[PDB]
Amino acid sequence: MISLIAALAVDRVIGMENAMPWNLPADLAWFKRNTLNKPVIMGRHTWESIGRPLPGRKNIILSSQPGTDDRVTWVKSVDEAIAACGDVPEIMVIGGGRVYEQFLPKAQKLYLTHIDAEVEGDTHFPDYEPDDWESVFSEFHDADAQNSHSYCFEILERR
Amino acid sequence: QLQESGGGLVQPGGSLRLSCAASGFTFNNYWMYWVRRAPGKGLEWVSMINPGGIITKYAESVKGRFTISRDNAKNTLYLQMNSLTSEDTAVYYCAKDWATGLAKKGQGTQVTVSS
């Protein structure tokens, strides 16, 4: 199955974690727990923002202008990215906006962090028509000494 | 209450430290931010620091060059700026609750970096 994982700010703005004025180690932990031992697919801007492969995962970069870096797998198409994951139970798509857009129609599950921060981002998370998805897990957290803003985790599964 | 100071005219390559005196809230309980407004532009966050002053995060444009710090006993926030460049010219503000509807910042301090 294909799953997307994203952090959505107020108005569903998404962007690069390093450009955001939040510090959310709890969200980093959630991302790590849900992606470890799985392949992750990202676009070129996300790769360039992270600057290095995410350890403990197979990194696959979907772009039209491929890369210099032998630690990751470069692919040119959605079907190539999927094949690059091979025989696995769950493929994690970790963004870019354009990447989320390309994979959402194929996705069965969404892992979202809803952040109580109004921020400038690259774009918004794609329309996920409420009625195609059911919320199966949901948990709210306040801001604390380690996490600058309050956040809610949610998992949705496709109807 | 937040009041920034320490702004001025600095030659490129120079250093400057800004200060923000805080009152009227429990300073040591809050994340604090530095943000800036460059001529013609929106506000751009620059730096943030957690209550105890042990977690910091910097915008990519200032990493390796700026240091945010705080003195919870004095209720003051600091921004050390090194290797200043023309592109750092801006009104700098200290802010509480940045990126929320509770966001508040001072009147700001002007930094002009000019050769």
Curated annotation (Swiss-Prot), chain A:
- Give me the residues that bind NADP(+), please: 7, 13-19, 45-46, 63-64, 76, 95-102
Residues the record lists as binding substrate: 5, 27, 52, 57, 113
Q: What GO annotations for molecular function exist for this entry? A: dihydrofolate reductase activity; dihydrofolic acid binding; folic acid binding; methotrexate binding; NADP binding; NADP+ binding; NADPH binding
Effect of substituting residue 42 to Y: Increases catalytic rate almost 2-fold. Increases catalytic rate about 7-fold
EC top class, as a word? oxidoreductase
Q: Indicate the segments forming the DHFR domain, all copies.
A: 1-158
**Among its keywords, does the record have Transferase?**
no
Q: Which GO terms describe its biological process?
A: 10-formyltetrahydrofolate biosynthetic process; dihydrofolate metabolic process; folic acid biosynthetic process; folic acid metabolic process; one-carbon metabolic process; response to antibiotic; response to methotrexate; response to xenobiotic stimulus
Q: Name one GO cellular component term.
A: cytosol
Q: What is the effect of changing residue 154 to Q?
A: In strain: 1810
Q: Which family does it belong to?
A: Belongs to the dihydrofolate reductase family.
Q: What does this protein do?
A: Key enzyme in folate metabolism. Catalyzes an essential reaction for de novo glycine and purine synthesis, and for DNA precursor synthesis.
**Official protein name in the record:** Dihydrofolate reductase
Native species: Escherichia coli (strain K12)
